[PDB]
Amino acid sequence: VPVPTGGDDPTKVAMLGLTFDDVLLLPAASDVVPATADTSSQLTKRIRLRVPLVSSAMDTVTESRMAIAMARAGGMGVLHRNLPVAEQAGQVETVKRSEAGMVTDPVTCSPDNTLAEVDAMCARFRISGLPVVDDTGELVGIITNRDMRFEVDQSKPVSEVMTKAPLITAKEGVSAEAALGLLRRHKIEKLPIVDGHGKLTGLITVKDFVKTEQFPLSTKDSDGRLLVGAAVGVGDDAWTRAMTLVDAGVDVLIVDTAHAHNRGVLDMVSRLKQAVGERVDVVGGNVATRAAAAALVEAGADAVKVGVGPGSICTTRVVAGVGAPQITAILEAVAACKPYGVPVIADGGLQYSGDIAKALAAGASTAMLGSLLAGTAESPGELIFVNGKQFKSYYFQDDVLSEDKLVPEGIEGRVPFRGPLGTVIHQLTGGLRAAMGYTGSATIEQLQQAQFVQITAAGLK
């Protein structure tokens, strides 16, 4: 009649929770070579990554540089929201404008501008070449870096320095092979694209082709632009922020909260899904139970993010006494999401590449990376030397249950330097490929069927 651990209710202690350190992946029959294993996986219902890694929406992890680097490596970045709406939207714009199959609204100047104005425009948009259009809107020339580097008088007008029409151009609908042939024949880096009337429509650069060859794994939309995501909260400020981000061209909106089994979070997910769901994907915030995942799935989430106090000495566990070991949390959330085709993003608690393999094996489709990327070169911050070691030096945060509320006021900074993002991603992917080879998993979908062995406390000594 009594429960052995106390009391008379068998459900007072609901489950035994397993973390990453409690389990290992068992070897199985394999004909899979690690170099031939396919590591592509679904981020949402409509977005498949080549490398199943996403960078966290933390102000020490993901800004435009990290987002570009992650999308180039085959994953994706989620821009943090600890900043004004205009600044986050501009970061989305920066990521989307990094590269493309064809620039569809290129920056143009007029013949009357000075060279100082053109230099300012180039610095503002981080480009080096501008088509020149007159008051009619007609393309009268093009001014690039070569023309301006040899000029001293910055007050000179553009019409005096630009390469005047007729130019080397192509019509709308020009094939990529023809465009590159025209670029290589005339030994120029730029090719304006014009309509039937000759007015400018677009611009094609050799640099875009070189980037496409240099980063074959890039995460891109149908226009050849890198994908990016951004985080929003709950409220009306958050609704305005979400609409601005959608206008800027974002691909994924993450309703990013500490505790997503809340009616406000679910209403925000449903509102976003009905309002802008045909264009962007909506990812629901952090859950740790089967019921919360099912609630998010009913609300209409395209992916479910999992983890609530997942770390051992997490501030949520110490201060509030709340948590859920991550392996059991992922198993429970997958049990709710998998029947409906909704992917799962494992967020938090990861320390090594073996943890990534374990989390994917438990049923998650992607892993979100935080502290593993905070010290990298692409993460925000300035690089400084202190005593021969290297470090990275640096109104919002309205979530009532975030860890920054639970910690006392003080100081945090000087995260150590970890090097380029490429090496970290290469190491993590190598570990994942080794695990796939051991378990005989040709794909991530097969890895999600692998078996575990539970180890005792003696196995961690």
Ligand X SMILES: Nc1ncnc2c1ncn2[C@@H]1O[C@H](COP(=O)(O)OP(=O)(O)OP(=O)(O)O)[C@@H](O)[C@H]1O
Exposed/middle/buried for 265, CB within 10 Å: 0-12, 13-18, 19+? buried
337 is catalytic: no
Query: Helices 236-248 and 85-96: crossing angle, nearest 10°?
Result: 20
**Residue 100 within binding range of ligand GTP, rule CB under 6 A:** yes
**Residue 83 within binding range of ligand GTP, rule CB under 6 A:** no
**Residue 397 within binding range of a second copy, rule CB under 8 A:** no
Q: How far apart are CA 153 and CA 141, in angstroms?
A: 20
Place of tokens 């890895």: 447
- Residue 395 labelled as part of a binding site: yes
Residue 300 interacts, among Mg ion, ligand X, a second copy, none and using kind-specific CB cut-offs from 5 to 8 Å, with none
Contacting range for a second copy; rule: CB under 8 A; set: 17-25, 90-98, 109-117, 246-254: 17-25
- Residue 409 labelled as part of a binding site: yes
Spatial neighbors of 425 by CB under 8 A, at least 6 apart, are: 51, 53, 73, 74, 75
- DSSP letter (8 states) at residue 109: B
CA distances from 95 to 146, 334, 342, 422 (A): 26, 31, 26, 18
Return the residues of window 103-132 that contact Mg ion according to CB under 5 A. Answer: 128
Name the minimum Å distance from CB 141 to a second copy.
Answer: 43
Coil, helix or strand at residue 23: strand
Q: How far apart are CA 194 and CA 189, in angstroms?
A: 17
> Which helix (H) or strand (E) segment is 405 a member of?
helix 403-406
Quick one: 101 or 309, whose CB is closer to ligand GTP?
101
Contacting range for ligand GTP; rule: CB under 6 A; set: 92-100, 161-169, 248-256, 349-357: 92-100
- Residue 39 labelled as part of a binding site: no
Name the minimum Å distance from CB 328 to a second copy.
Answer: 4
Residues forming beta bridges with residue 385, ordered by sequence position = 390
Of 81, 97, 358, 433, which one interacts with ligand GTP (CB under 6 A)?
97
Name the minimum Å distance from CB 339 to a second copy.
Answer: 11
Give the active site residue among 109, 122, 314, 337: 314
Answer whether the bond into residue 166 is a cis peptide, omega within 30°. yes
Coil, helix or strand at residue 352: coil
Of 176, 180, 206, 243, which one interacts with ligand GTP (CB under 6 A)?
206
Return the residues of window 294-313 that contact a second copy according to CB under 8 A. Answer: 295, 308-309, 312
Of 58, 103, 161, 415, which one interacts with ligand GTP (CB under 6 A)?
103
**Residue 309 within binding range of ligand GTP, rule CB under 6 A:** no
Exposed/middle/buried for 350, CB within 10 Å: 0-12, 13-18, 19+? buried
**Residue 141 within binding range of ligand GTP, rule CB under 6 A:** no
Asked whether 23 and 452 are in contact (CB, 8 A), the reply is yes
**Residue 129 within binding range of ligand GTP, rule CB under 6 A:** yes
Name the minimum Å distance from CB 106 to ligand GTP.
Answer: 4
**Residue 189 within binding range of ligand GTP, rule CB under 6 A:** yes
- Residue 404 labelled as part of a binding site: no
Quick one: 160 or 298, whose CB is closer to ligand X?
160
**Residue 236 within binding range of a second copy, rule CB under 8 A:** no
Residues forming beta bridges with residue 232, ordered by sequence position = 255
Q: Residues before each break in the chain (C–N > 2.5 Å)?
A: 394
Residue 401 interacts, among ligand GTP, a second copy, ligand X, none and using kind-specific CB cut-offs from 5 to 8 Å, with a second copy
Quick one: 180 or 275, whose CB is closer to ligand GTP?
180
Side chain identity at 8, as an amino acid letter? D
Contact footprint for ligand X (CB under 6 A): 128-129, 142, 144-147, 163, 167-168, 188-192
Asked whether 333 and 325 are in contact (CB, 8 A), the reply is no
Instruction: Give the count of beta carbons closer than 10 Å to the beta carbon of residue 48.
Output: 14
Coil, helix or strand at residue 447: helix
**Residue 412 within binding range of a second copy, rule CB under 8 A:** no
> Which helix (H) or strand (E) segment is 263 a member of?
helix 263-276
Coil, helix or strand at residue 434: helix
CA distances from 40 to 49, 51, 425 (A): 5, 5, 14
Fill in the per-residue mask, 423 to 442: x = in contact with a second copy (CB under 8 A), - = not in contact.
x---x--xx--xx-xxxx--
**Residue 73 within binding range of ligand GTP, rule CB under 6 A:** no
Give backbone dihedrals phi and psi of 324, rounded to 5 degrees, phi first: -155, 120
**Residue 30 within binding range of a second copy, rule CB under 8 A:** yes
- Residue 349 labelled as part of a binding site: yes
Annotated binding-site members for IMP? 56, 312, 347-349, 370-371, 394-395, 409
Annotated binding-site members for NAD(+)? 256-258, 307-309
The set of catalytic residues is: 314
Annotated binding-site members for ATP? 107, 128-129, 144-147, 163, 168, 189-190, 205, 207-208
Q: Which residues bind ligand GTP (CB under 6 A)?
A: 97, 99-100, 103, 106-107, 125, 127-129, 145, 189-190, 203, 205-208, 211
Annotated binding-site members for K(+)? 309, 311, 314
